[PDB]
DNA sequence: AAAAAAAAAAAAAAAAAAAAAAAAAAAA
């Protein structure tokens, strides 16, 4: 049984059971690339995160895993991208702006952070525009570093605690959709973390300042604070079946419309019964709110210059226990 | 868990399963709003429809639902609609004519009603025009008042049984789209009632009479029975698609014609066999016919003045059977 | 469930599927009406086609369809058609001339042949003239007799082997548009026949030559075949979107200029990503053809008194392989 | 106890335990088709097989079983397919050419082979296409024949031995799917015999080569060997959950995507555990690759115009041990 | 059953409507 040795960073302990039978893994950072490992309890509990090793590897009983580590020793990050780096789809690290983030709404797990990055243009000046991080959800739970996040709760907490922060983000891979649409997107081997700024520098905030978003097409994700009425009415038509809101925040009236489709993996029944549930939770949500019992913010995708369309991106419910209703 | 007290009208229960668990709502009209609650078995026999209640609701597991209920008691219809109120775009209630409702042809569910209201011009004179309501299939279902409806058959029959009644509109939105188009709409908490006149007034029956209609531009919906032949020829031509039909009524030849387009949420394949299938079934209707086992009437968007353009609004079938082939 | 008998022709069996389910349908020809039946796969192998059957339909689950067939036995094509009869737009069957065949240039399925037929007068002599019958694909494809098609190539394979070729028409529709403009159209009921002359008759061949053509106003479409050099320049102007384009035919130099617009179901991007394309098809269109890996036919609407507008009607190209590029 | 006499083929031999009891079963072949009889241990050792027999059969103890045998004795194989017997779903036997054959990834038992068989078109031309004849474990065991196979190991050593040798197919049923897709299927009375050519003939090697297959829409399945990086990177989104793969051939960059769902009858738990073992092991994959202490075989569904689809139908792993690792 | 499939942006709807010839544009 010949062996390996290799030396690398660790991002996330992990166990899981199968069919009575325990398997510990480890997804050890092996020159800039994933690589996941087995391992024994003692190993399970003796390792911590973020910290580098040198492991040696047996293939034994039909998969590789750590016999023997050894402690070892080992960040520039970027304050701006290039639209050629977008272009070219290179994983990149980048300093950013982490405004807030909620779950896509009528979506099981696909939550959707909002970055301010500096764009760099084909000119060469750097501006603040805003970018849209997609990810399920233990993507996120095992990406954020200095943190331990075992439910949709810990995601939100971490979320909130954190906003306005400012993160350093570690091998987001930057892509480029068929259109002019640029998303960041976050990697098996990427992470992030909470710079803890305390005011360290304050001539660039200036900068981070987003007056459009390089994700949609002239279209601006802003979260709004419900504080009166919510009215949600169903309208199903010849096409589409929409979810015509109309809100109350603190300064202005707000006309949103969610929209709806069958999902090619889904049945007649199955769809009606989630839109209908949809429906009566919206329903619930205006008297929910008149009464405090819950406070509501919706980040939604505004135009603003036309205000013609402005679905809804996410709904998120802050409630008087503390937990995080995603909706 | 603090509680709420709530009076307010009932409008439809409503049952239905998820994950081997089972989900009752009521859709209670509180402050002339739709809200639905949760409720269990006894709450939904118990209730009965259209009588007002006095509930307590108390936020457990994640939802507002009925604790209690006791039973309480409590309609004032505008007989006109101004100019400016369709401007306004503002709900209302009415005493209209319920001529004759048709399913769209080659629409899966947005039924379409056709009533006769009296509109006042700017002038300040009351006459009656015709409007459409459009409405998918369950909302009309749960809008019909003294009727229950479960299928296509049921809401048929409960359109032809019904047909030249006069009809009690309760909150029907009123709407008026980009060009002068007027037409009402059926929200949730709105509903419809048989006002079983038995000629309780006749004066007003003379106003009843429809000369243009306000939804279309210079054209009107009307039924006809066919009667002989049914000849229905496609015609796909550099841009459109078309069905040629000529059809042969009680007094008239009527040639009118069909149109096709591909929904944005189609497929190269899945139109074309829809398409196909409407051709097969439009060609095997006149054999049905001149052998008395269905009965056809047509509902077409016809022009007096200008027979150039007569598009079949939809088309519906009488089986010997009794059921109503939609179409 | 009454049942029907009815004896007619059969014009071409099809397969379909929807939602893994299966339909035959058989285009039965009644009384001169094309009339559709649904069928078992057993009927769909048995008939053939062409051949007349008696069948009895009985009205089960929605549908007519075939219970069970027996086999049965049973043409006059008139030489000439009236100045009156194209006025009366009546149905008819003709004896005429397939000159040549194109995909109208810019058209998804449209395609549209050139025919000779006889003419007669208002006073009464018969010459030949040439009318154009456009047809979307599908119905060219199951109205050519004696032939089977799938696919473009097929199709084009139909027409340019049988080019020059006298054909008889079953149930052409002739009609007559707003101005003097005469056409035939391919109607479901109708057929195509290679008449497979071998020189049966020559006393008629002189009559079929065409000096004008009665569907454009003094313009004649012809076809030519590009021998050298094929400039395409695009113009686009304060109102059009021309191709100016120049070629050398075996005799001489042709000035053209295909023309552009939007269609009504278009945008602004899309229209303009078509137009570059065939932009491109256009300018490669050259160097393909100068070293011979295609062959090119160029059928354009000329008009030999006034060279000013020689519209192109259609391109078409002849690879290597064999196979037939459309564009 | 009434007798009765038979004579058949035998097919594959058998023994099981049921609580404490001993039951062998001979799959005789009667009539061209499958039926199992009971035996005794006798004879279980004494029958060979593929060698035909003659039975008296007593119906004793609720079973029929082998009273007594005499030995007896007794292939024409076509050459080519008709498009027509595809069609007809008609059992055949064939001459045809085994490519390759891999454990569908991601399937518990499901193998499947890759044949190239001589398909003659409606036309009458034969040319060689690609066919995927799918099967379950023990039906492809007990189908080798001159092949003894008990576990995975055998199964694939009888595969990768055997690559690219003539096999003659006995009563391989034919199958045609909803849409234009062809497939072969092992039934139980279906055999696979290598013919061991040893260039026997050489004028028909030159027809089984493989442009299109007959059993996917435009698409091929071909075998790369991994040679360099082997790049898998989990990615879900909002609908799917993607492997997208990258790896080194001999020759060129491949650029994967292997897909994901949860089958009916799974958990959420159950399905999550099972794709993160996967994906540890495709992690995995590539240090063990680097390394030679396994070698890998990728066998994808390319598209050779259009590589934007290239989802992985299988991949195996040759361990330096010897033995077949599925994966 | 097995093939197919990059997502993830963008989206008021719902009236209207024979088509298919014709045409050089740009000055004034």
Redesign the pocket.
């Given at each position: 049984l010949r062996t390996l040795n290799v030396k690398g960073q660790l991002l996330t302990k992990t166990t899981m059971s199968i069919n009575n039978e325990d398997y510990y893994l480890f997804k050890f950072l092996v020159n800039n690339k994933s690589i996941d490992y087995y391992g024994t309890q003692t190993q399970f509990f003796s390792l911590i995160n973020n910290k580098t090793y040198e492991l040696v590897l047996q293939y034994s009983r039909k998969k590789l895993l750590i016999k023997s580590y050894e402690q070892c020793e080992d960040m520039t990050v970027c304050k701006s991208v290039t639209f050629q780096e977008f272009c070219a789809n290179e994983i990149k690290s980048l300093l950013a702006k982490f405004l807030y983030g909620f779950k896509?709404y009528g979506s099981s797990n696909?939550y959707?952070l909002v970055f301010v990055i500096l764009l760099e243009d084909n000119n060469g000046t750097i501006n603040g525009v805003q970018v849209?991080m997609?990810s399920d959800f233990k993507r996120l739970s095992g990406a954020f570093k200095n943190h331990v996040i075992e439910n949709e709760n810990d995601l939100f907490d971490c979320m909130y605690k954190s906003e306005e922060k400012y993160f350093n983000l570690y091998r987001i891979k930057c892509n480029h959709?068929?259109?002019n649409?640029k998303?960041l997107?976050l990697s098996s081997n990427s992470q992030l973390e909470r710079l803890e700024t305390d005011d360290s520098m304050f001539e660039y905030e200036f900068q981070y300042d987003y007056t459009v978003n390089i994700?949609?097409?002239?279209?601006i994700i802003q979260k709004h604070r419900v504080t009166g009425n919510f009215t949600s009415e169903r309208?199903i038509?010849?096409?589409?079946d929409?979810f015509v809101i109309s809100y109350d925040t603190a300064n202005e009236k707000i006309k949103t419309?969610?929209?709806n489709?069958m999902e090619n993996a889904e049945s007649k029944t199955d769809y009606d019964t989630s839109i209908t549930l949809k429906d009566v939770t919206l329903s619930q949500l205006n008297s929910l709110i008149e009464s405090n019992l819950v406070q509501v913010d919706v980040y939604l995708?505004t135009?603003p210059n036309?205000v013609?369309?402005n679905?809804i991106?996410g709904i998120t419910k802050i409630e008087i226990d503390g937990t995080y209703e995603p909706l």
């Open positions: 896509i696909v959707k849209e997609m959709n068929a259109n649409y998303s997107s994700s949609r097409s002239n279209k309208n038509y010849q096409n589409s929409r419309s969610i929209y489709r995708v135009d036309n013609k369309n679905v991106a």
